[PDB]
């Protein structure tokens, strides 16, 4: 779920900058869900 979304964010036609923000936001849910 996380890896499938992170890898999809990666191939998007957006800036690197935005790729990282969305990446950070996604694994923010994964970390809070597991904490």
């Amino acid at each position, epitope marked *: 779920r996380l*890896s499938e979304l*992170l*890898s999809k*964010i*990666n*191939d998007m*036609p*957006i*800036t*690197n*900058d935005q*790729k*990282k923000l969305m*990446s950070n936001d996604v694994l923010k849910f994964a970390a809070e869900a597991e904490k």
Partner: antibody, heavy 122, light 108 residues
Framework: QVQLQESGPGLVKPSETLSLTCVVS????????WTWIRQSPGKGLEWIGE????????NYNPSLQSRVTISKDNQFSLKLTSLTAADTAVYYC??????????????????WGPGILVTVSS | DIQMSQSPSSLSASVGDTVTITCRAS??????LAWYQQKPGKAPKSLIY???HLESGVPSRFSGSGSGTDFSLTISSLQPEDFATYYC?????????FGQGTKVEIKR
């Protein structure tokens, strides 16, 4: 180490299709984004596009979007159609960053092929 | 398309000189600037890839700095193998775009 090598005809006619193939050595094709880049004396280095080495998902240069295809055949190819003299250039395949996750190496190339001179002329 | 402008285009230097090459981007690029080296008849070689990050094997005399829109490739104590063309490349946005190159030539 990983090595790339271009192959294909280096003489193409104006309206007909440019076809090039890049085979990957080292054995890590499905982990990286793979690219095509071309260099012209008039327009310099141009990023043609990228391809997700696992899925085949692509992102093209808008200036090339409507007539460019990058695809899996450790081998991937570039097809450019409806050519003109302005497509005359040395074409390189190259390795971008990993597909799995964003890394900061995203969008730059680390390894290049030797390059292929494609001549567009009648 | 983000336009990339290198200054100077040509440059005369000697062995042991410190040389710097400017690369300007038309917009911000979140400091995603790469540098490449190219010698005649050869494919370019990757030098630096996130303003400052040296590619493996690259001599430490090559250093990258800069921010916002202005970036610098600095070669400290130039060597005979460094005489070549250097290109910058933004790798933040699509499409990826390159400068016109800066040719480092031998002064005599």
């Amino acid at each position: 180490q990983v090595q790339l090598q271009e192959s294909g005809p280096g003489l193409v006619k104006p309206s007909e299709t440019l076809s090039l193939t890049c085979v990957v050595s080292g054995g890590s094709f499905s982990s990286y984004y793979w690219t095509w880049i071309r260099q012209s004396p008039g327009k310099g280095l141009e990023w043609i596009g990228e391809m997700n080495g696992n899925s085949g998902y692509t992102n093209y240069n808008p200036s090339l979007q409507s007539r460019v295809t990058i695809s899996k055949d450790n081998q991937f190819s570039l097809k450019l159609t409806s050519l003109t003299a302005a497509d005359t250039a040395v074409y390189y395949c190259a390795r971008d960053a990993i597909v799995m996750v964003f890394t900061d190496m995203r969008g730059r190339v680390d390894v290049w092929g030797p390059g292929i001179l494609v001549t567009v002329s009648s | 398309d983000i336009q990339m402008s290198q200054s100077p285009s040509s440059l005369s230097a000697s062995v042991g000189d410190t040389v710097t090459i400017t690369c300007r981007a038309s917009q911000g690029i979140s400091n995603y600037l790469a540098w490449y080296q190219q010698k005649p008849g050869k494919a370019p070689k990757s030098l630096i890839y996130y303003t400052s990050h040296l590619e493996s094997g690259v001599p430490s005399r090559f250093s990258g700095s800069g921010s916002g829109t202005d970036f610098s490739l600095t070669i400290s104590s130039l060597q005979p193998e460094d005489f070549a063309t250097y290109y910058c490349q933004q790798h933040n946005s699509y499409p990826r775009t390159f400068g016109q190159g800066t040719k480092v030539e031998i002064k005599r």
